Design goal:
The structure is a homodimer of 394-residue chains.
Chain A lengths: L2 H6 L5 H8 L15 E4 L2 E5 L12 H14 L14 H14 L3 E5 L2 H11 L6 E5 L4 H9 L3 E5 L4 H9 L7 E6 L11 H11 L2 E5 L14 H5 L7 E5 L9 E5 L1 H10 L1 H4 L6 H16 L2 H19 L11 E5 L3 H13 L2 E2 L1 E3 L10 E5 L6 H18 L2
Helix pairs in contact in A: 3-12, 4-12, 5-6, 7-8, 13-15, 14-15
Bound molecules: ligand S5R (2 copies).
One copy of the ligand Cc1ncc(COP(=O)(O)O)c(CN[C@](C)(CO)C(=O)O)c1O sits at the interface of chains A and B.
Subcellular location (chains A, B): Cytoplasm; Cell inner membrane
EC number (chains A, B): 2.3.1.50
Pathway (chains A, B): Lipid metabolism; sphingolipid metabolism
Amino acid sequence: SKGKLGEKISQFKIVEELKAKGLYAYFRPIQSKQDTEVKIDGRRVLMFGSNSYLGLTTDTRIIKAAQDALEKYGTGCAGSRFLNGTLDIHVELEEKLSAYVGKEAAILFSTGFQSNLGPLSCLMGRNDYILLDERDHASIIDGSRLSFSKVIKYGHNNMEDLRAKLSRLPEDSAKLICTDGIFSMEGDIVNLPELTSIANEFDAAVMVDDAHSLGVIGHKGAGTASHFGLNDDVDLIMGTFSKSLASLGGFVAGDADVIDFLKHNARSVMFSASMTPASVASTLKALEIIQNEPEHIEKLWKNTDYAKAQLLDHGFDLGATESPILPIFIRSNEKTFWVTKMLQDDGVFVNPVVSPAVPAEESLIRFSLMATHTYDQIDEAIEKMVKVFKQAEV
Amino acid sequence: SKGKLGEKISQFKIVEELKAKGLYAYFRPIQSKQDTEVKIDGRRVLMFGSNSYLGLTTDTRIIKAAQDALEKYGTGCAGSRFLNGTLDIHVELEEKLSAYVGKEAAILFSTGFQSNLGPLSCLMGRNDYILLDERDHASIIDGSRLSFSKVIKYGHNNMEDLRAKLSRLPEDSAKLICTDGIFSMEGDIVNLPELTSIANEFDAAVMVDDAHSLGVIGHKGAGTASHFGLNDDVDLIMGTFSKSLASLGGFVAGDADVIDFLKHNARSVMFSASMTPASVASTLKALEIIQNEPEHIEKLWKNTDYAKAQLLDHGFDLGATESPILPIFIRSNEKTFWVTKMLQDDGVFVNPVVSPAVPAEESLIRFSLMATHTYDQIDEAIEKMVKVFKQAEV
Ligand SMILES: Cc1ncc(COP(=O)(O)O)c(CN[C@](C)(CO)C(=O)O)c1O
Ligand SMILES: Cc1ncc(COP(=O)(O)O)c(CN[C@](C)(CO)C(=O)O)c1O
């Protein structure tokens, strides 16, 4: 029955208003492979809104690995890893990821989102505490909500606030600090040295979500702990397969005893179907390529350095990025929507960040680099971004 | 840091004890396609522990559709549907599913698990109520936890308890009842006529999770509402792609205004990468086959009726199944583990159900049928199940 339900959703008018004004640019239907140029409405559009940082979703070798796994293993495992859904290739990928991030063991999940829900839901219990950076990914907030522990947020990369909040807690409780490694909105990196120093002083567990770090920072792309040399001081490395690794799924890597506990207690692995064979094989081959062909991470960083320098030359106001995410401040929700749609209609795809996710005065567009971008594509996008910011009067 | 973390997991000894006794049968590593016979350790094993009810993960046409989508679209969309992750084929699948279950609109999720988290997390808020059957899937419990509403459980298929609990609630609040359609443990069907009668009397929203119903009950497999003719009285039909539909992902289907609210407010669709092209195409082709080739649902039911009658003839104690899930009571955790591993070593895969998921006296094995099973395979499994129950003394 719909009376009260109709009421609950009656106040949500922003999509109706964006569509009526001709500004709506969510769920844009792409007709081609994810690539530096995509087809939308039969038109070619430059993609600067992706998370495919190394451009590997189009690699013929990765496509072939996925097609070969469909031929051997079929379209799906039809159950949880716990029961009838484990393949020899799931276990191969866990071993390969464990070796990559320098940990004893790993457990896969069918999504990155589910990879955060697992450990955050089941390690800390009644009378325990989870400490979250206030800018942590939604999956981390939600995982922590699913725990039976007390969740405390600390100020973004604020080590005094983290120290103070931990200082207030009973000695006779378990603590877990969970942080993004690279934070996707502004593209900044966690202060892992000071966070891990604090963790060690309070005997708190440390988990890092490397969604945006894998294939980007660290030796051969191995992530945020690898970037700082702090493998030893991080208990759990979480990552996802949907960004650099060009696939779908995620993992948590850690000590064999912790991972064994997780794989038998995390509801998001016990009660959800396992990764498709095609996604296991695509992740396996992508991981091989990232490690063996250093040119991908190199070209991503050459594109990042070039685009950041060109943006600052043209006088764009950038956020404090340390990554291939270039946040360009606009500071008006209305202008952010207008700029996004005008760039779309001029053949440039960027991602808006608006209220209520951020204050209006901190609204921005995110311009993300891939290794496969050319300096010419970057120049064409920045040209068009100069023209639209002028027409919009920023 | 690991001190307190080491303590939190120190008491979890059941896996260490199962492995040491040679009884462990979780995460069994399959070396072949999910099929009526699988390869484990180079040995052939009969699969009666699957959710591939129509046996479609091996259909050459579905494999080919998935391989063709990899060729055209690559290995992954590399972002949320909300931003850069929507393909023309996502929208095609939403339209096809909406038509199938007789609803205005649908939104996909990258997992079934995530398809429950979306609506349950974001429709009911502060001062609202979610009513859950006590045997609801873990994904439904967790989705409801992620809401800011008051979650109330009612006795399993207990319509007096549901009526009473709803009667106690303020008139001036929104209510949502969420139920499995087929409940996977005992294989029983929700009393949808009485639940929807109660919902209509209290103006409560109704959501049904058709994970185990799609491709099983309803006209051409269209699910639990279709089974009862109650399309009109169910607000939201949720399903998954990982069972009959031989893939990975899920959906929620409903009125256009509700679905539009969900696709812009559900954290599990806004903040998680979209389904792989290979999984969209495999789901599309599987859905076409289920509707066009009625023989699959027919043979599933012929196998279900044959196996249930053979089991009852041999005097097995079955649960109150109305589905291709045949729950066989053992009523001892120790005997349940022993029976499961002895059947595994004799070439028969079944799924155990033990404490703490159920009371020891209600421990059982689940024996699940696929359309592709033969009467000879069924006879061989039941033969072996007679022998092992004898050796175990049940
Ligand atoms: C009733 C319902 N609802 C939702 C889901 C989640 O779907 P997903 O697996 O993510 O595609 C399951 C998964 N059920 C499985 C995986 C098999 O029954 C389990 O072991 O619990 C389920 O049984
Ligand atoms: C930091 C972190 N952690 C976990 C995830 C979940 O991974 P999954 O997408 O399920 O593979 C995301 C997804 N992030 C995306 C999808 C792209 O940034 C987003 O729009 O929020 C993420 O940014």
